[PDB]
Amino acid sequence: MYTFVVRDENSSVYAEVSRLLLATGQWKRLRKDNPRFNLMLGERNRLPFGRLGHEPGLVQLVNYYRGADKLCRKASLVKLIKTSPELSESCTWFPESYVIYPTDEREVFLAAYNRRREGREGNVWIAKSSGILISSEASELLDFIDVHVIQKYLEKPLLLEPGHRKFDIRSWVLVDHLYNIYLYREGVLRTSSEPYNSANFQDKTCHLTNHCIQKEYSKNYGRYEEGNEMFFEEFNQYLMDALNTTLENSILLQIKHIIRSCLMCIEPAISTKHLHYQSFQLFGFDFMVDEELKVWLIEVNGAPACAQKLYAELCQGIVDVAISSVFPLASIFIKLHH
Amino acid sequence: MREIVHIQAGQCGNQIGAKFWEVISDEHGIDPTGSYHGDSDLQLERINVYYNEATGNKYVPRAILVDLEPGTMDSVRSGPFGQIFRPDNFVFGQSGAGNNWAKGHYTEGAELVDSVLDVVRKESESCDCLQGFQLTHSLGGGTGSGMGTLLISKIREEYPDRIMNTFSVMPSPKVSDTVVEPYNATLSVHQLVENTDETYCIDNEALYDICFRTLKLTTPTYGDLNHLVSATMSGVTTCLRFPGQLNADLRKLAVNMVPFPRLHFFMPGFAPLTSQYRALTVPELTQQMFDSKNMMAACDPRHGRYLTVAAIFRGRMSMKEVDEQMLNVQNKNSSYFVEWIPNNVKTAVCDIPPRGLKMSATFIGNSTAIQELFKRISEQFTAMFRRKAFLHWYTGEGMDEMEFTEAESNMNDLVSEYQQYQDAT
Amino acid sequence: MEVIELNKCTSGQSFEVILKPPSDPSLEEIQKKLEAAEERRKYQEAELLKHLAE
Amino acid sequence: MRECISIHVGQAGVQIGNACWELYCLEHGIQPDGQMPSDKTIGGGDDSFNTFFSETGAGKHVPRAVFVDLEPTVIDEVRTGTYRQLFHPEQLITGKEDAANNYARGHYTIGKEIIDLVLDRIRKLADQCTGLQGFLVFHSFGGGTGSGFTSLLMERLSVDYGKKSKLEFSIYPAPQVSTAVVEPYNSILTTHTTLEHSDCAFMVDNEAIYDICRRNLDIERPTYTNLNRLISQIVSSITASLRFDGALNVDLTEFQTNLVPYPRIHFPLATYAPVISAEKAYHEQLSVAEITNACFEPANQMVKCDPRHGKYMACCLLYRGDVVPKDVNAAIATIKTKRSIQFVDWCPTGFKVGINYQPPTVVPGGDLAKVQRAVCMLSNTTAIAEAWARLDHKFDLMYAKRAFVHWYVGEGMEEGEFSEAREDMAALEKDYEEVGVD
Ligand SMILES: Nc1nc2c(ncn2[C@@H]2O[C@H](COP(=O)(O)OP(=O)(O)OP(=O)(O)O)[C@@H](O)[C@H]2O)c(=O)[nH]1
Ligand SMILES: Nc1ncnc2c1ncn2[C@@H]1O[C@H](COP(=O)(O)OP(=O)(O)CP(=O)(O)O)[C@@H](O)[C@H]1O
Ligand SMILES: Nc1nc2c(ncn2[C@@H]2O[C@H](COP(=O)(O)OP(=O)(O)O)[C@@H](O)[C@H]2O)c(=O)[nH]1
Ligand SMILES: [Ca+2]
Ligand SMILES: [Ca+2]
Ligand SMILES: [Ca+2]
Ligand SMILES: [Mg+2]
């Protein structure tokens, strides 16, 4: 019988995975500090990778890729895209971003800022970190930071109708021990229930699509869709009736392309192919879509939460693809080949 | 040349000690006359640990036979290997101990202990480098229990830097001679807690159940019980008598098995136990070796936790399969092994199996469940002591009731100590 | 890659490849600690013999 | 020419040392009786091989080695072994009873009584040396002698030979072959006491050697003989520069200069390749790029860890066989464009390379197959701290309950030395994290 441990009690995703493993009758949960385990549902911070794979007669698997923080951090993601030749400074699907400390890129950020101001182009930027400020004057942004990143705020976002409202697309991607990239077929659009107003960026209810900000500061929460969450079936139908296109052609192709580029970039540095232990990990990609139907990458979450309607299917998929593949018992994913 | 001095005291001690020398003598190719007639140099590579080499290439067991009655020792001298023992190593009295700890420890025994120490001294003076001592005895009688623990105290005083190891047979109402056995056993246990480094707890209650339940012996005898003890004693001493890497001597065994000085009471186990020509696979040896029905202490291991475990596999078998099966037992029941002692299960393999078996396995566990043995004795002790029943046999030899109260308290402490580590996280 | 300090002989050769530039206790004190531990052993044994004498 | 004295302590050090000197004689053409036909200078000379071998008037080449063990059975195998004629009785030192896997017993109790004898026997070898470089100390971490007596010997060596360098070949404890539960205690106790006395230490984790033997040699249950023959190959690759003509790592001082910028961080990671089974008639000979690329595979390291999640402070490549500098640089270029190799900012990103044209020598009838070329990478990477983390964790688990502590106090050691040694390992882990983490 396979054994496993739980070291992140706050993980809603793997709390279901653990519940499923127990229900199989072929998995046994041990104390969180017992080393004779086959699988570790590790903690978010300071997971002791150095102590894995040193148990004789135990194939050990962990649900996190050591080093994947480079991709799942605001400043780290920016540095990775600029310095990595595979992604290049000429990356077209990632907004222009800079890392500013309260090395540093203060002078470089203001350089491109002055260029836009002269050319009369939309010179709005957003500052954030791992509390956000959206301003059109650079002076306010730097004064606000006093580790943060400043990237071009997409001023022409694709707005859903009715509502004239903003949104963002969350994609769940599972990478197994063999580094197969599995994209969950089910996504979620976290929509803003307020009409987009490009006049005053201080009212962030219509500019931030976060599921929490919409349920706390938005007066139209849940008006158009249950919980400001639109799934692909409805969103695809809209794209057909409104823009005469499909979700696959107009957006999904660029999303799969971006997921491959990011994960294949760090594969040499995090792959556990010839390692004494194996890793998998569930990622949360967040994309923006502009009025031209171009997809932009916003960030990548290393410990994402699933949608309520999708926990069952996705969590069951994690067991089949990531766990049972290494520990067999007695498709909902799109395999991104590479 | 790391010599061990063997001592057997009392009826039980001498009857089991004799069988022990009969068993290991056969394994090392020694005949009842001390002449070696083996076919493998492994039989002689470590023969000096237990045998002296005399004139004519004779091998003399380094054994000392002690008793306050000559009866049982006369049987030894007439037994199968009776002629192999050094005649001068027979030290005995005539009065006996009457199953009375006070007589063996304070009166009858005190008069004979000095002559025993003289023989022990003669053996030690010829040891190139004495490891320590090995005592066989019961705790329910008078000589092995009372005088045995007296000898241990005086051996420690004269050899304080040597290891003391004992095979101690615990009494049980199922296989009982007198009602005072709980008294004698409770008094001895405290002596063992202080003055031994390693004690194999052999529970006559377990030996009886195994003979009746498993071996299908409807009317088990002491000889039947002693068959299990011989096989177990041969197994637990394999790592001392043959070349090996793990627990090769008494001190290294203590370092691996005793995390705390007072918790040095082990549960021995043996496999197979057949009621007989079928081959026993390595998975079968491992499962049976860890099964409570194969334990010699009548304690349910699943009622406590393993502090340390020593396993010994004998015979020609796949060492890779031994490692896989041992790792399977731990990994499939890791909740019974304390987590604060990493890798507390050590395994050894000896190519020479015991007589009449293609392969076997001996289990040596330091489990906190051993407290059930001491609780059992503690309850029987108190049932009588609360009414001072049968105390006159002991006060008549100079003992006071306070010494019983202190022995009672000491064993309850020992039980409490096992309990705190059974809960420790 | 810059190869520097190349040395060759009959049995082999060595060199360096640069890919990128950069960006006690005394004898007495020991004897004391050894004797200190030995003394602690003598004290523990004396206590044992005292206990056994009782 | 400057002499080097090898000291072997405990079972692991003795049996490994026995396997090393067997390989040296094969490499240098020295026969079991000590004779060396290719040596034309009879009874003397200051050749490179003389750093490890002295010469008698009769033409015998005697290893500059000392074997110490508190139990005689292991050294007795050297007295009656194949190369028994190489050594003389004064070189072999044995006791009556061992340290019983107890650091305190080996350091304080038994060490105090035999230390003067060992130093005296070492003094005899030093008297033969016109310019002694230092010492190479082979020992285990988990054994009572290898841990306890080695730390005492190292302390005294710093007193009697202050200007001499000292290098260690240490065996990290692995439960798959370990023989004691308290080996984490002994490992940390001896590392603490020895840290300030070792200039450079090469740790070999038995787990790594064990798996390499099972994986690459097809050994179902590797023995110490299997493990020691592979370890002697690694040790030989590391000491070849001292025994053969060359310009890299030609003296013990150069090891610290090339591999240890910070003194406390003096545990280089060793990676060896290729390890080919001799049970297969033919095997595709690996190229310079293939064996060099294997130096960055954790499966070939002497200590399982992930250098990708660390930083390099220095990196040496020791080739043996058909290898020319052109192929090395070409392979290094490819590996850079494919491997995660990060150096600390205050260090140049580079590789010191050494090539010996004589291909590796294998014990006739052993398990390792002859190969046309092999390499041993010595890289000082912070990733090796994972071994310290594993060891310190097991220490913490047992010491929290004071498990087995009474065995050490009973030998005269104070319980405070435990926490004193643990706090030192805590500082060591912190230094590694500061050097190779952001
Ligand atoms: N690689 C290798 N490891 C060994 C060898 N012998 C022992 N070991 C390891 O060393 C550790 C035990 O230390 P030993 O060297 O055997 O003990 P010791 O140094 O003789 O000290 P004592 O306790 O006095 O016997 C265990 O982890 C063993 O796995 C060997 O020949 N080769
Ligand atoms: N460059 C940009 N242009 C336009 N809108 C942006 C933007 N960056 C962020 N946003 C908006 O801000 C919201 C939150 O941003 P971000 O994802 O960086 O913070 P966060 O980490 O707290 C949410 P999550 O962890 O789910 O991704 C996004 O949903 C998006 O609608
Ligand atoms: N296993 C076993 N137990 C015995 C034997 N003889 C006696 N006993 C047990 O030992 C206790 C009696 O001790 P005994 O040796 O006769 O007393 P002593 O001669 O004065 O030391 C009782 O609990 C018996 O059950 C024997 O041959 N084998
Ligand atoms: Ca009398
Ligand atoms: Ca010469
Ligand atoms: Ca120094
Ligand atoms: Mg986030």
Ligand SMILES: [Mg+2]
């Ligand atoms: Mg009787």
Ligand SMILES: [Mg+2]
């Ligand atoms: Mg030893």
